[PDB]
Design a binder for these strands. Structure first.
Ligand SMILES: [K+]
Ligand SMILES: [Mg+2]
Ligand SMILES: [Mg+2]
Ligand SMILES: [Mg+2]
Ligand SMILES: [Mg+2]
Ligand SMILES: [Mg+2]
Ligand SMILES: [Mg+2]
Ligand SMILES: [Mg+2]
Ligand SMILES: [Mg+2]
Ligand SMILES: [Mg+2]
Ligand SMILES: [Mg+2]
Ligand SMILES: [Mg+2]
Ligand SMILES: [Mg+2]
Ligand SMILES: [Mg+2]
Ligand SMILES: [Mg+2]
Ligand SMILES: [Mg+2]
Ligand SMILES: [Mg+2]
Ligand SMILES: [Mg+2]
Ligand SMILES: [Mg+2]
Ligand SMILES: [Mg+2]
Ligand SMILES: [Mg+2]
Lengths: 53, 222, 185, 148, 51, 155
RNA sequence: AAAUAUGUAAGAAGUCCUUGUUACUUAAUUGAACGUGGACAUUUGAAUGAAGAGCUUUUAGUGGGCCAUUUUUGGUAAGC
RNA sequence: GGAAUACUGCCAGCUGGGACUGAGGACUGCGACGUAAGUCAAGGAUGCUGGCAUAAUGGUUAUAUGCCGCCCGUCUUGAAACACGGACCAAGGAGUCUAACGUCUAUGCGAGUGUUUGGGUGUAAAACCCAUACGCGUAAUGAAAGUGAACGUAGGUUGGGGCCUCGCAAGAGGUGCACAAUCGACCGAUCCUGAUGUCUUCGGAUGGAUUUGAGUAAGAGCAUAGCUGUUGGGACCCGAAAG
RNA sequence: GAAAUUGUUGAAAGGGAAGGGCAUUUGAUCAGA
């Protein structure tokens, strides 16, 4: 991470102004559109009890 | 040889300029919120028209209220509540949602009620019970000058700038949220809505994630 | 109820006034309280704090210590400030000319300074000359050279001067102090 | 004085600051240095190692006057000269008419060589001298004259 | 000396937030949304009504 | 000495009050109190009397008349919180009440007050007479009967 | 072979570069360690918090415990 | 196909009733309204009015009523206890003084400090004055014979308040006492090495070491007093059976 | 010339103790303005 941060800082100071060198925790997911083309929702129901012994 | 009038006039002029800046920024915030809300609604409608499902972005902000007293708390949840600044029952704080803080909310679930605060909830919370931590002292946010004097270095000039930095989890959310003293809420005015507070909200209790009903609860407690 | 993360009603643990009832010391404290409040001089703040210190926290500063501090490069013309007693030291034979401000001067220390051609001034004279602590050099005596200190932290393998009334052979030197008698330390 | 003691403050408090469970009994651990080897062993070995046993050889009828030999380091060596004469002896550091210092008369038995003296010849009369003390005196141009 | 609550005390509400006057004047709390007439897809409706 | 008088004494200088931000704005009395309305007096020596409401005075009191010829209640002030405003109205167009103010009632009976009573009562009774049984209504005292529930009663 | 619990790390006392000391080490300026010199501050390098942090002296009482949930041993069991 | 309504949510939408509070005490602030004068609900109650002017309010006390309230002290995990002492009241009644000390603090003086053994003197157990000693400190280390503290700006490095220079400022540089870590140097002990010289067995230079010291490295101590703590003393008070 | 304890007088209360706390009624008593 230190090596990559040095490289990223060098490229930043050679290109422009942006660093974002600190790690970040996993973020909440962004919005997404889920398609049903070939993926029409399949309805499930809880199963009745049985023994299968 | 008075050195008073030409300074009071200068101060009034500077105050007018700062007020004009705040007014323009608040108008921009109103436009931002309206556009984002209508865009989310239209995105849902468009996905439905296209036969898809618009999965909204996961919530970036939670409001957490400690609903349990201070006695008989195991040490790990006790430390987590301290680190979230919930050291009194009905004390509430804003938490930015990451994995690092979701694993804290998980640990303190049986002692807190938390959810996703709306703009109205945040606005009323800050307006009525907004206190800043200034010189380790709890100072009511009765004037935009207090907010500018303590958060102006982060670009937050007014109470509405503070609210914007809270609701949109901005680059300086950590600083603004920490400047906000933990909110000291009352008990809910219409009660808790359940006979027993200390089972999960899903199980008919009060604690855990009550995601959007946190607004009703906090508005009753505020 | 509140889950306190720190002790309640905890005093700062620092002196806010001298324990001494010396009226003149209190006058010096009043002057430097005013100065530390209304100058923003770190020198004034540290002098005010030093005026509260107990006797063991104000070890004497010898003229030889002052002379070494003046031998510091660039410090030869600075006024030396000792919030405490300046003592004489005959082990040094060349005292330079300088201004020393101190709470107290030993007769011998004052004689040596004046003979070298400098002056011994009080802290209020120092305040009038340098209200912001200009061109000052604060010196402090050796705190941990006290006889009491060498007994602190006594224990096995510490090397910390047992508390003892008589010294010599037969006095705490046999069992626990050499391998030939049981063990050493 | 009694009016400042904590026993005035313990009036009305039943145990007088000595506890309810473990009271102020007479001699719970024994008297004096009792049990230094048995139940006070930890407090003896810590804070007083070397206490028990013998460590050397005896000396019947030892007289301390035999061993009287106060030490004076070269660092002073000049407080023995009266203050007024000290300046005119320090100035004009002459091989002739060098100041004579009777350290035995001043009350010292051996001259040690801790400090450093100025380059001024001094005739140091002493019963004993450290080797380094003598070399430093000679380097300053003085001499050590043994006396008794 | 005394905390005056905005959301009451219109004077304090205007001391903070100069935009409150514009908000009230333009009735931005009762903003009408533009009418749109997109219809959900038949797959959405069938899935919703599916048993 | 018996007490060893204090080193310092509190100053005997009564400080000025700071400027009060409480302006006196006019009273907003309830909409049921319109001049000409029949009021029921709830307290005072004329408690239970039904009187006619008149000019609203500057001290927030209500000027009322019985009329005196009808029920013996003269021109007098009442407190608006001690009356029940019925829904029965007479016309006060024709009654001149510009003369009656606070200084009119500020502290045997004055002939001037008797004469003003006669003048006001004349027009008041003229207006009252064109409503059947209104005169007897104003003569009768109000009282709660058994079963009366004021929270449901309409006045 | 889990869950819980647990060690370490997440920087300026850092990363890298040039070359001085030695009686150590190497076939060998080979290396080792310590140095001299040089470049790299907005996020100086996850989160959250921090009535601050660090340090010292000196002494009181106490050194019979018991209870609840959970883990658990002996015991048929026990308010063992 | 076009509406409505429910449900949920939002409004910096309007408005009615009720209760508790009125802290502060010239002005200063942020605002609102007004073109401006100025006004305001804007850094905490004012305006108007009535009765009374004393037992009326209030205090105290006794009682009554509603609800609550086991007997203290003590040992104890646990006492209201079917654990112990206590019928009652007065008076007496238990951490003291001393020798020697630890920490801390105040004071005097300070490489010194301590007049009070004693002498002088006295307005006579006071106060005042004083020589020589002596105690502690200024040197340690070794069982001892004995030896005995600067390579150096009394060291290097890292940090270090304060000060100094530059800079509007941030910061940069310099100097850095106390103090902390660390590597060195010096003294003593221990183990080696063993020069010139020679009473030829003395002397012990020089250079070393996984060794060791309650050391040095520009002194801090001495004295008086106070709380607290320690030890011996009857030793906080009272108590054996014994000898 | 205290208290324990007691007589008389006066006041009050009193269905198997008494005493106490909060609050007010009633009686008595009283200061302040
Ligand atoms: K004990
Ligand atoms: Mg309710
Ligand atoms: Mg319940
Ligand atoms: Mg509390
Ligand atoms: Mg206690
Ligand atoms: Mg006891
Ligand atoms: Mg307040
Ligand atoms: Mg015990
Ligand atoms: Mg609705
Ligand atoms: Mg007031
Ligand atoms: Mg009363
Ligand atoms: Mg009960
Ligand atoms: Mg008990
Ligand atoms: Mg029982
Ligand atoms: Mg017993
Ligand atoms: Mg008994
Ligand atoms: Mg008594
Ligand atoms: Mg006995
Ligand atoms: Mg026997
Ligand atoms: Mg008598
Ligand atoms: Mg009696």
């Amino acid at each position: 991470r230190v090596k990559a941060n040095a490289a990223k800082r060098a490229e930043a100071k050679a290109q422009g102004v942006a660093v974002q060198l600190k790690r970040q925790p996993a973020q909440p997911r962004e919005s997404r559109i889920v398609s049903t083309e070939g993926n029409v929702p399949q309805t499930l129901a809880p199963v009745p009890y049985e023994t299968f012994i | 040889a008075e050195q008073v009038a030409a300074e009071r006039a200068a101060r009034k002029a500077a105050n007018k300029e700062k007020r004009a800046i705040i007014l323009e920024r608040n108008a921009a915030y109103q436009k931002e919120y309206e556009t984002a809300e209508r865009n989310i609604i239209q995105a849902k409608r468009d996905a439905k028209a296209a036969g898809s499902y618009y999965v909204e972005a996961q919530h970036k902000l939670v409001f957490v209220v400690r609903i349990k007293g201070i006695n008989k708390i195991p040490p790990k949840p006790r430390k987590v509540l301290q680190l979230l600044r919930l050291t009194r029952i009905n004390s509430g704080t804003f938490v930015k949602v990451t994995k690092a803080t979701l694993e804290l909310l998980k640990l303190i679930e049986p002692y807190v009620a938390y959810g996703y605060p709306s703009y109205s909830t945040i606005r009323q919370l800050v307006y009525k019970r907004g206190f800043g931590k200034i010189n380790k002292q709890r100072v009511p946010l009765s004037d935009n000058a207090i907010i500018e004097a303590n958060l102006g270095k982060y670009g937050i000039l007014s109470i509405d700038d503070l609210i914007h930095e809270i609701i949109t989890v901005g680059p300086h959310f950590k600083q603004a949220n920490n400047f906000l003293w933990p909110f000291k809420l009352s008990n809910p005015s219409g009660g808790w809505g359940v006979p027993r507070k200390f089972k999960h909200f899903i199980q008919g209790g009060s604690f855990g994630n009550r995601e959007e009903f946190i607004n009703k609860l906090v508005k009753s407690m505020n | 109820g509140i889950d306190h993360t720190s002790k309640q009603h905890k005093r700062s643990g620092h002196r806010t006034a001298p324990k001494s009832d010396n009226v003149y010391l209190k006058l010096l404290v009043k002057l430097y309280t005013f100065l530390a409040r209304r100058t923003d001089a770190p020198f004034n703040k540290v002098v005010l704090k030093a005026l509260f210190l107990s006797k063991i926290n104000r070890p004497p500063v010898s003229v030889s210590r002052i002379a070494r501090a003046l031998k510091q490069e660039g410090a030869a013309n600075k006024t030396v400030v000792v919030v405490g007693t300046v003592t004489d030291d005959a082990r040094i034979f060349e005292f330079p000319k300088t201004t020393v401000a101190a709470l107290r001067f030993t007769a011998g220390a004052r004689a040596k300074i004046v003979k070298a051609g400098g002056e011994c001034i009080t802290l209020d004279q120092l305040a009038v000359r340098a209200p912001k602590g200009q061109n000052t050099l604060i010196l402090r005596g050796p705190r941990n050279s006290r006889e009491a200190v060498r007994h602190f932290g006594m224990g096995p393998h510490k090397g910390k001067a047992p508390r003892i009334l008589s010294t010599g052979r037969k006095f705490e030197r046999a069992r626990g102090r050499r391998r030939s008698k049981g063990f050493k330390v | 004085p009694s009016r400042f003691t904590k026993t005035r403050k313990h009036r009305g408090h039943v145990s007088a600051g000595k506890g309810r469970i473990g009271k102020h009994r007479k001699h719970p651990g024994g008297r004096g240095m009792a049990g230094g080897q048995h139940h006070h062993r930890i407090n003896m070995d810590k804070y007083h190692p070397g206490y028990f046993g013998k460590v050397g050889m005896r000396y019947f009828h030892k007289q301390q006057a035999h061993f009287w030999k106060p030490v004076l380091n070269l660092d002073k060596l000049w407080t023995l000269i009266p203050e007024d004469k000290r300046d005119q002896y320090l100035k004009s550091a002459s091989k002739e008419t060098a100041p004579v210092i009777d350290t035995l008369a001043a009350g010292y038995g051996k001259i040690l060589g801790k400090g450093r003296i100025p380059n001024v010849p001094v005739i140091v009369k002493a019963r004993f001298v450290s080797k380094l003390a003598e070399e430093k005196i000679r380097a300053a141009g003085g001499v050590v004259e043994l006396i008794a | 000396v005394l905390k005056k609550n905005p959301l009451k005390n219109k004077q304090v509400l205007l001391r903070l937030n100069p935009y409150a006057k514009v908000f009230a004047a333009e009735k931005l709390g009762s903003k009408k949304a533009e009418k749109t007439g997109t219809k959900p897809a038949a797959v959405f409706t069938e899935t919703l009504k599916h048993d | 000495s018996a007490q060893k008088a204090p080193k310092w004494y509190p100053s005997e200088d009564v400080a000025a009050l700071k400027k009060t931000r409480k302006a006196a704005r006019p009273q907003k009395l309830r909409a049921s109190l319109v001049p000409g309305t029949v009021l029921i007096l709830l307290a005072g020596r004329f408690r239970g009397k039904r009187v006619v409401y008149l000019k609203h005075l500057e001290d927030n009191t209500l000027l009322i008349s019985g009329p005196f010829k009808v029920n013996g209640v003269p021109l007098r002030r009442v407190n608006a919180r001690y009356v029940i405003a019925t829904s029965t109205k007479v016309s006060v167009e024709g009654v001149n009440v510009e003369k009656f103010n606070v200084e009119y009632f500020a502290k045997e009976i004055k002939a001037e007050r008797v004469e003003d009573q006669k003048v006001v009562d004349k027009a008041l009774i003229a207006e009252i007479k064109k409503t059947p049984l209104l005169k007897q209504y104003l003569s009768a005292s109000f009282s709660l009967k058994n079963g009366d529930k004021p929270h449901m009663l309409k006045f």
